[PDB]
Each structure stands twice: as structure tokens, then as C-alpha cells.
Write a protein that binds this DNA or RNA. Structure first.
Length: 89
DNA sequence: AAAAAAAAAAAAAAAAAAAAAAAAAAAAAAAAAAAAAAAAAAAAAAAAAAAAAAAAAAAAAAAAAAAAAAAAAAAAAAAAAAAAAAAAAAAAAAAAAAAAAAAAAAAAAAAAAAAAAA
């Protein structure tokens, strides 16, 4: 579902299961900002495929905030992508 | 080779949790005024000291409020039953240092493979 707003949440508060899962799977080690190393990114194409409704847009904005604030080099290098599934058939 | 326990199939019973978004309150941790407390200067009312003095305890003795005796009568407090408040004694406990077992990196060297030379 929805994840923490890192702009509002404290750095120590970032100990949820979902952010830990994203940090482990990406393996950039975004936590700490001293073990962070974007060269060890396991996937060079990270795709934010949220639902087509407005809540999907909100979750997309939350993920964009997390990637921009915690992993600025990944966003700057252009590894982040956004999928566009259809709402209607 | 016998016993026992896990797990999985599918219709049933019953539960639990994480975040977003704004506005108000309540804990809980800090700077920072603000006043006690303490160290170290100079400074100044009190004891000392002395001579000089006169105000209240002694003493005579009456008398007038008194503390023991007598009586009647009212009924506060003490000790025995129960029923609550509030504190040491003793035992327990959750993190927390210590120990032991498994995952990841390491190169030495060779089997098998791929590739090419004459």
C-alpha cells in the first residue's frame, strides 16, 4: 500500500518493512548515507508501476520522494522509470 | 521394519497490522532568566570597660480570694471486638556479556573446454 513520507518522517523512523525491502532489493544501501554506493545497484532500470487510479498517483509521488531525497544519484543517472498502465478498456 | 509427527489438499469457525492526510492536545527534553549559595575585599555596631547610681526583694502584718472536704449528678475516655491503609521481605525477571555454529571471500592448482598455428 502506501509507504512512509520521508519528508515528514524522521530518519530514525525509516525502519518500516517496505523501505527496508526496497533498500535490500536495490542493494544501494541508502540507509545511513555512508554505506550508500549507487555503483552496486542491482537493476539499472527501476520501474514504478502503481495502479492507474489517483491513489496510485499518490503512491507514485511517495516513491518519487523516497528516491529523490534518499538516493539522489539514482534519479540523476536516469535509472528511474514510470509505467503507464491503462485505466479503462 | 514398527511408531510418531508434519504437511498438503477444500469448505468452515474466528482474529490481527502498516501507512497518508490536518489540527489539537499531551509528554519530554532542551536554552535561558532568575534567584540561593559561596569566596574574598573593606568596613562599623557591639562587647568591653569603668565609674556612678537608685528600683525592687526583704521585712512587719491584716484579710480576702482561695484549694480541700462534702455532695449530687453527667457522661469523656479506655480496653475489647472488628475492619481498612500502608510499608519491608523475599522472590522473580529482560537485557546483556559470553560462547559456539554457519555464510562469504579467498586464492593453489587442474579438468574440461575453446581457439588457433604449421
Amino acid at each position: 500500500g502506501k509507504i512512509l513520507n520521508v519528508e515528514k518522517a524522521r530518519f530514525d523512523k525509516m525502519l518500516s518493512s517496505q523501505e527496508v525491502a526496497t533498500l535490500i532489493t536495490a542493494l544501494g544501501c541508502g540507509i545511513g548515507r555512508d554505506e550508500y554506493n549507487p555503483d552496486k545497484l542491482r537493476y539499472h532500470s527501476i520501474i514504478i508501476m502503481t495502479d492507474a487510479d489517483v491513489d496510485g498517483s499518490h503512491i507514485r509521488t511517495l516513491l518519487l520522494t523516497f528516491f529523490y531525497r534518499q538516493m539522489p544519484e539514482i534519479v540523476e543517472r536516469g535509472h528511474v522509470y514510470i509505467a503507464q498502465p491503462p485505466l479503462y478498456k
